[PDB]
Short mmCIF file of C-alpha atoms and ligand atoms in Angstrom, two decimals:
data_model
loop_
_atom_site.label_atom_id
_atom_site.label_comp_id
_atom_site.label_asym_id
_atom_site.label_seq_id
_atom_site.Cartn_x
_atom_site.Cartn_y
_atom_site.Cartn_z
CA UNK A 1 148.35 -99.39 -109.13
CA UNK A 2 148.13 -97.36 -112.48
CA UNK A 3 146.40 -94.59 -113.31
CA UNK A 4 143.50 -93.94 -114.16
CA UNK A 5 140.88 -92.61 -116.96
CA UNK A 6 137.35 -92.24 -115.72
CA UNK A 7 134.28 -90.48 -116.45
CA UNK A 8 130.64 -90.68 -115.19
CA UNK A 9 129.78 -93.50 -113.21
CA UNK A 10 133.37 -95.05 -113.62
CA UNK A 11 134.42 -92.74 -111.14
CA UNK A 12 132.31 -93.58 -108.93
CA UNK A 13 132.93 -97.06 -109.54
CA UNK A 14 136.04 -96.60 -109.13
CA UNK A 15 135.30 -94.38 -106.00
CA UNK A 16 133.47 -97.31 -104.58
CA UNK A 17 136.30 -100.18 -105.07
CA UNK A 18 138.85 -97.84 -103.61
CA UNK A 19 136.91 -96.70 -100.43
CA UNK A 20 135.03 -99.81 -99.27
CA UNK A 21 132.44 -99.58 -96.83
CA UNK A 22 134.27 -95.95 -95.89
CA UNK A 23 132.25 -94.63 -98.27
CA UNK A 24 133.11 -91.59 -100.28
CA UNK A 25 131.10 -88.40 -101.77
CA UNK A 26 131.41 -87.53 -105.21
CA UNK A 27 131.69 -84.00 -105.49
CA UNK A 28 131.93 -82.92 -109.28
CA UNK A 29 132.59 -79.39 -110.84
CA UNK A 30 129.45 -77.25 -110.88
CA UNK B 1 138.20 -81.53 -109.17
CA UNK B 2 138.91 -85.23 -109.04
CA UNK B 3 136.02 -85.72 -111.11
CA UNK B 4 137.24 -83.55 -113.88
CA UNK B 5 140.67 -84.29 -113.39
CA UNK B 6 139.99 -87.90 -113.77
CA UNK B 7 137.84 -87.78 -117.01
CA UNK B 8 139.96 -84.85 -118.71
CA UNK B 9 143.40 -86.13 -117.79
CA UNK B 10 144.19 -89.04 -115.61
CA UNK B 11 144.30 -89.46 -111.50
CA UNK B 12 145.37 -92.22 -109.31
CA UNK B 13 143.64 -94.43 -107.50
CA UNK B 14 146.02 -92.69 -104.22
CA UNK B 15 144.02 -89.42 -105.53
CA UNK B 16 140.72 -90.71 -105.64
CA UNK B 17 141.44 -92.26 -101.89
CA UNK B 18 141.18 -88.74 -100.27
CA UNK B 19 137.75 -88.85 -101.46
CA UNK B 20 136.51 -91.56 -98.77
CA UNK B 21 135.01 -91.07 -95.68
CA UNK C 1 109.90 -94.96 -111.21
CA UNK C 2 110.01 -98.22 -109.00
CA UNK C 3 111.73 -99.59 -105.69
CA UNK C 4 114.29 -102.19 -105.95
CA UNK C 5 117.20 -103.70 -103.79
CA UNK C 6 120.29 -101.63 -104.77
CA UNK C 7 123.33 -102.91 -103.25
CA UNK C 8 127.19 -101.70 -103.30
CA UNK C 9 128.50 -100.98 -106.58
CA UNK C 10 124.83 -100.46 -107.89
CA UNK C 11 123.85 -98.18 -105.17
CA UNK C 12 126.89 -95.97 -106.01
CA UNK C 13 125.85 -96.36 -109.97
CA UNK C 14 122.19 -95.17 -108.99
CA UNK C 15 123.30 -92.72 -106.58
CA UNK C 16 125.24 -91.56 -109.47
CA UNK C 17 122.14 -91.65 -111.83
CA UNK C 18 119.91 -89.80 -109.35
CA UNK C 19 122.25 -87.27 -108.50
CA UNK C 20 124.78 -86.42 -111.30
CA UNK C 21 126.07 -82.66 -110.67
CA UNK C 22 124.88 -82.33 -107.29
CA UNK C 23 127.11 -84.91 -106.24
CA UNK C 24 126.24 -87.28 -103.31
CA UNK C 25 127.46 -89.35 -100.38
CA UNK C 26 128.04 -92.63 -99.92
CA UNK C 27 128.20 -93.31 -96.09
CA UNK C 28 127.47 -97.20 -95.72
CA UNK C 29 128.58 -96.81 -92.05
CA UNK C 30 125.88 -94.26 -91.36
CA UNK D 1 121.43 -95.44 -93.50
CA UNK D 2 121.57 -96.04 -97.55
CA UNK D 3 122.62 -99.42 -96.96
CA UNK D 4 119.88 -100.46 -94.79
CA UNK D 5 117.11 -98.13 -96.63
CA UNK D 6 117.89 -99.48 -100.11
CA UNK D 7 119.99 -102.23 -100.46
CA UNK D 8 119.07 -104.46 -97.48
CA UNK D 9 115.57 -102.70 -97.42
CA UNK D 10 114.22 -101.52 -101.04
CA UNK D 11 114.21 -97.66 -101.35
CA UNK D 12 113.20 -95.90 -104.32
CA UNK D 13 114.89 -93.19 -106.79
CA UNK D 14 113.10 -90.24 -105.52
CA UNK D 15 115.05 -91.68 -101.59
CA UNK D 16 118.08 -92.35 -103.17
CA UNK D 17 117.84 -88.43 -103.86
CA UNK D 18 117.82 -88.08 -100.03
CA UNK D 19 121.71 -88.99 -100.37
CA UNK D 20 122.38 -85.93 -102.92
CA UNK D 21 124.39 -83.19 -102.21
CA UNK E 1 116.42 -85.97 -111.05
CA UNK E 2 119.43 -84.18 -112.95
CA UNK E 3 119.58 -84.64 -116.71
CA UNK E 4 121.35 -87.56 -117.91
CA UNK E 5 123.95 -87.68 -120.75
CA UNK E 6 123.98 -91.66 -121.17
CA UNK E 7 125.84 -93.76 -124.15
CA UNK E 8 125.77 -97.21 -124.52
CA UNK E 9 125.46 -99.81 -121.64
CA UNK E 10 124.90 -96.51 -119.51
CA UNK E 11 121.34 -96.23 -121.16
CA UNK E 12 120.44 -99.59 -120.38
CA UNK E 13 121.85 -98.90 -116.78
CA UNK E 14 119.74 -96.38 -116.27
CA UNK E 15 116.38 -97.73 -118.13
CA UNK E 16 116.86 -100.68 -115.89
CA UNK E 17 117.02 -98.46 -112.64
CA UNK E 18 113.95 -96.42 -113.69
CA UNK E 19 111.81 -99.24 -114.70
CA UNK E 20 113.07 -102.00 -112.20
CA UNK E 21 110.28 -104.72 -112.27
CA UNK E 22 108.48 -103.34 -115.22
CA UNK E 23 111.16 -104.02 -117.58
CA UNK E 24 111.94 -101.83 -120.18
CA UNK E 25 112.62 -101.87 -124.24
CA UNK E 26 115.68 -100.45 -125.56
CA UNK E 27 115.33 -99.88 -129.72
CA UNK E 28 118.26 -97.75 -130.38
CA UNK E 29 118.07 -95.99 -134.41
CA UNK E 30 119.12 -98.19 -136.81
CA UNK F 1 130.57 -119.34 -124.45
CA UNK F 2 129.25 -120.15 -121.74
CA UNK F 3 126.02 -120.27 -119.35
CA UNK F 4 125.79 -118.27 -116.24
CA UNK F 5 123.49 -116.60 -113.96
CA UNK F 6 122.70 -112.84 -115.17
CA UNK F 7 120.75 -110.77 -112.91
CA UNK F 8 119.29 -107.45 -112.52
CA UNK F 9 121.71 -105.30 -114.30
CA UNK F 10 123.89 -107.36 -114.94
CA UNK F 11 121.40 -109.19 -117.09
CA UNK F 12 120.63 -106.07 -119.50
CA UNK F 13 124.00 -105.52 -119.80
CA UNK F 14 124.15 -108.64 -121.86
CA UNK F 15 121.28 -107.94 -123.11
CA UNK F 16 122.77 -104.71 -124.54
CA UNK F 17 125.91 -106.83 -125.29
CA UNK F 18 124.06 -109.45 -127.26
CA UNK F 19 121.38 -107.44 -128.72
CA UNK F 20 122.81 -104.04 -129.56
CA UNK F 21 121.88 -102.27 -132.24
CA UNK F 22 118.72 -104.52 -133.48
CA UNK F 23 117.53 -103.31 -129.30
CA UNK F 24 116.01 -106.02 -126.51
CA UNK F 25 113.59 -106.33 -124.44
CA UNK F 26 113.84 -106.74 -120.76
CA UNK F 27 110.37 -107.77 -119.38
CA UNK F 28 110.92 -109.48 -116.02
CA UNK F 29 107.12 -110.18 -115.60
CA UNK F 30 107.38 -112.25 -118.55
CA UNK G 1 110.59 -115.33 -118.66
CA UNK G 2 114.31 -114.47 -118.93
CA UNK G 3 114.95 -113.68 -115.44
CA UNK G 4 113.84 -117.75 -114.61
CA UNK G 5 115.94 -119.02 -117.68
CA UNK G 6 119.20 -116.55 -117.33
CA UNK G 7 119.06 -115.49 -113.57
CA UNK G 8 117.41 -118.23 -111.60
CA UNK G 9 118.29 -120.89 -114.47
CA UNK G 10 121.58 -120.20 -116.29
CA UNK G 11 120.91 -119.57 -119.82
CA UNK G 12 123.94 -119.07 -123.01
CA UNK G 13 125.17 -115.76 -124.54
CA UNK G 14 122.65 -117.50 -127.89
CA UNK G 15 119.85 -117.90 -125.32
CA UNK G 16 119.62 -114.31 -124.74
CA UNK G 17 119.32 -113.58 -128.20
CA UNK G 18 115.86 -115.08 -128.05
CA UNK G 19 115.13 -111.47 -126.21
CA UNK G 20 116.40 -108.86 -128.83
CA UNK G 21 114.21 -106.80 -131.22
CA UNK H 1 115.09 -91.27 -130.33
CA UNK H 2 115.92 -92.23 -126.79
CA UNK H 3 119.26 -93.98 -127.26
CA UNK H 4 120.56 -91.24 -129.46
CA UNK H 5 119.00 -88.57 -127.46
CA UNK H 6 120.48 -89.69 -124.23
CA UNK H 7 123.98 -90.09 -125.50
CA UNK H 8 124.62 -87.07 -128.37
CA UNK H 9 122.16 -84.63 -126.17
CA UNK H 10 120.86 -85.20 -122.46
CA UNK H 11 117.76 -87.11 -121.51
CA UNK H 12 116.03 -87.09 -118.39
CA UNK H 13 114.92 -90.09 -116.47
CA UNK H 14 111.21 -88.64 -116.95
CA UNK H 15 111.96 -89.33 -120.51
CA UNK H 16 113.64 -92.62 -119.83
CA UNK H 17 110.12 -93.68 -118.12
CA UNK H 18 108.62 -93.71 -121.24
CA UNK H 19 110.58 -96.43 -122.47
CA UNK H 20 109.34 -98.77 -119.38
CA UNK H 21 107.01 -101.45 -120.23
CA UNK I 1 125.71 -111.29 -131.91
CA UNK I 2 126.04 -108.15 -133.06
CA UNK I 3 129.62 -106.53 -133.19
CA UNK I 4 130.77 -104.79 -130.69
CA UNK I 5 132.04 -101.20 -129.92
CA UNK I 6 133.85 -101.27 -126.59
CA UNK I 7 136.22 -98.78 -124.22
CA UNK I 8 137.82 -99.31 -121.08
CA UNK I 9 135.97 -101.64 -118.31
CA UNK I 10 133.02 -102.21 -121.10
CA UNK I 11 135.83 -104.55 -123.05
CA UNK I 12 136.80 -106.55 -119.81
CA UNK I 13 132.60 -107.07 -118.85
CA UNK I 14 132.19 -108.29 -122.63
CA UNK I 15 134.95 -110.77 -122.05
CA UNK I 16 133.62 -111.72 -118.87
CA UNK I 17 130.58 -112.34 -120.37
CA UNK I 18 131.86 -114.03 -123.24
CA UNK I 19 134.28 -116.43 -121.13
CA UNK I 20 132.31 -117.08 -118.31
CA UNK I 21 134.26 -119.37 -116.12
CA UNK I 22 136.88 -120.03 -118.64
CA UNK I 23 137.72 -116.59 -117.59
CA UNK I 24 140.34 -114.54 -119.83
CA UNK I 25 143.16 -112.80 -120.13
CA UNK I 26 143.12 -108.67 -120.83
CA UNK I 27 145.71 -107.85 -122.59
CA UNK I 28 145.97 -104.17 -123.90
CA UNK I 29 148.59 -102.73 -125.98
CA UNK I 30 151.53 -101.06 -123.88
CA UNK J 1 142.15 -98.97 -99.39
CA UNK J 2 139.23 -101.09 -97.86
CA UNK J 3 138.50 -105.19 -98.22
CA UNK J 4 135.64 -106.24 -99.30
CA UNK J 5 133.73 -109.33 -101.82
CA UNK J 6 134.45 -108.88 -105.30
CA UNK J 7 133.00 -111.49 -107.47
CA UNK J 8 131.79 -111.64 -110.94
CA UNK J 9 132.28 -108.85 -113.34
CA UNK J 10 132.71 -106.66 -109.86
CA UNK J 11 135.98 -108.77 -109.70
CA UNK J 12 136.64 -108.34 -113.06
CA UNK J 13 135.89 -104.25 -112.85
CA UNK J 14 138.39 -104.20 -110.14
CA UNK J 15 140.90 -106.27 -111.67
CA UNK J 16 140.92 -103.86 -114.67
CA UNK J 17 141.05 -100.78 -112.38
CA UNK J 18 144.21 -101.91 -110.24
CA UNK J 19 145.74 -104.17 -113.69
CA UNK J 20 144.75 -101.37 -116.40
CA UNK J 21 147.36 -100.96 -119.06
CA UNK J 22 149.64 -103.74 -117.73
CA UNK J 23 146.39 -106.77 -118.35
CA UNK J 24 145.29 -109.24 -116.39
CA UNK J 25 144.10 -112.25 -115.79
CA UNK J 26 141.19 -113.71 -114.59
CA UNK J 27 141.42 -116.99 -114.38
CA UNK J 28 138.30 -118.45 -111.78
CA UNK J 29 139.00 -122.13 -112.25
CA UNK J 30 142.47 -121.97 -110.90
CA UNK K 1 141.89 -119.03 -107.22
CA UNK K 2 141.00 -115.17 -107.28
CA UNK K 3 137.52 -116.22 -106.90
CA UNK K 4 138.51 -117.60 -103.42
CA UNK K 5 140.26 -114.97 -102.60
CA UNK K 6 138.58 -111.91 -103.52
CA UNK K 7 134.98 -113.24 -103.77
CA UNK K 8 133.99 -116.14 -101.38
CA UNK K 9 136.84 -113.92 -98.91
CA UNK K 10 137.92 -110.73 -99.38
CA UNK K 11 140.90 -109.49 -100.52
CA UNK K 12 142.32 -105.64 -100.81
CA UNK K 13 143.28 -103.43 -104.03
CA UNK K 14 146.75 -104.68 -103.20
CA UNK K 15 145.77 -108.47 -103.49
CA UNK K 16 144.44 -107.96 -106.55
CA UNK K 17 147.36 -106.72 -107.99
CA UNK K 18 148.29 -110.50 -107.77
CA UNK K 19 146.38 -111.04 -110.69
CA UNK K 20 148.23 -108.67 -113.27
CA UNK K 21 150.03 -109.14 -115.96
CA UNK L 1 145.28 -106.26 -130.25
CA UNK L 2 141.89 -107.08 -129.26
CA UNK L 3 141.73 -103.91 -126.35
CA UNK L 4 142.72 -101.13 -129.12
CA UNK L 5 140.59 -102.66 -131.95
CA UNK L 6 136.62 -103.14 -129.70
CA UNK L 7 137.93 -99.16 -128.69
CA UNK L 8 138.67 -97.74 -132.03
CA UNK L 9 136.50 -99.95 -134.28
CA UNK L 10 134.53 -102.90 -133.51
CA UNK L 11 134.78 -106.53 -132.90
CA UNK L 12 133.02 -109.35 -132.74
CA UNK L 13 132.07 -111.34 -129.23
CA UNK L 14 133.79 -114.22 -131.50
CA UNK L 15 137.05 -112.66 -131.31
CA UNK L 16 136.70 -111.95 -127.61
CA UNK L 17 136.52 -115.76 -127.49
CA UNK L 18 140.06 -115.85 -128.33
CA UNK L 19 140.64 -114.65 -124.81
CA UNK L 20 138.98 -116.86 -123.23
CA UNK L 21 141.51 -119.08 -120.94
CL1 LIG M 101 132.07 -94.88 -121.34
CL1 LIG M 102 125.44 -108.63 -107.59
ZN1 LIG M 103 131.28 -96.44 -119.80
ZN1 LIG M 104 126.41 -106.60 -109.62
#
């Protein structure tokens, strides 16, 4: 895998592909 | 955070894994 | 606003959308 | 949970909320 | 609802989440 | 190109791609 | 409408034109 | 207006409803 | 069509589109 | 990492996520 | 294909990687 | 190429047909 450059919702896209039906929380900065 | 640190600078997809449930 | 099916990636994208800054879960497991 | 409430069900924007932090 | 900084597809994204079945225009300047 | 089912988002999305700057319309109810 | 020719039908990149401004 | 708004400024999706048919 | 102004996975869902079941190749510099 | 049905652009998203910089293809007809 | 693979089965991060360049 | 030219000006869905397989 490569890294990775990802703001707004392509985090959490990316968030989503990586944790599968684990789920994940997206937890930004303020 | 991984939020910032992934839209400011970069972060792997082995980073954003300790995110999951 | 409406209701609509939001599945998977989408659900994350809304979740996203709805929430922003708060941040949010994803917990498909419950 | 989401799943069921908005993807298998329909669920609007203001429930999707209910999944904020 | 958070505020929304949107750009591109992101807009439509998020006009088609808020209108769902209603539909929505998108007439971007220019 | 080709033809292909577009849905939902996925549908405004090429919408937005096709469209772009002269906008769309995305009225479901026809 | 465009959700019977591009989603339920299958409808070309030029067929969706037919829905811009 | 709401395309420019959204993406050089914030919008809110109260402002977004506007833009629904 | 209108040209096209495109970053990141935006490029890659414009190909997608544009290919359909051709598919494509992505091929970025370095 | 999780399993799970990728098809479509979602397939195409992920492919450019795990690819990025070293490209991909996507290539449904085999 | 991929589309076997990935779509009509599923396939991890790491079978994906099968498709890069 | 194609990647670094849609990114830092624009291009045409026409010469995102060149990718096509
Ligand atoms: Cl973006
Ligand atoms: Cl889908
Ligand atoms: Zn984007
Ligand atoms: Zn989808």
């Amino acid at each position: 895998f490569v890294n990775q450059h990802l703001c707004g919702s392509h985090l959490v896209e990316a968030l989503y592909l990586v944790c599968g039906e684990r789920g994940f929380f997206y937890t930004p900065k303020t | 955070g991984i939020v910032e640190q992934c839209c400011t600078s970069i972060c792997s997809l082995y980073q954003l894994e300790n995110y999951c449930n």
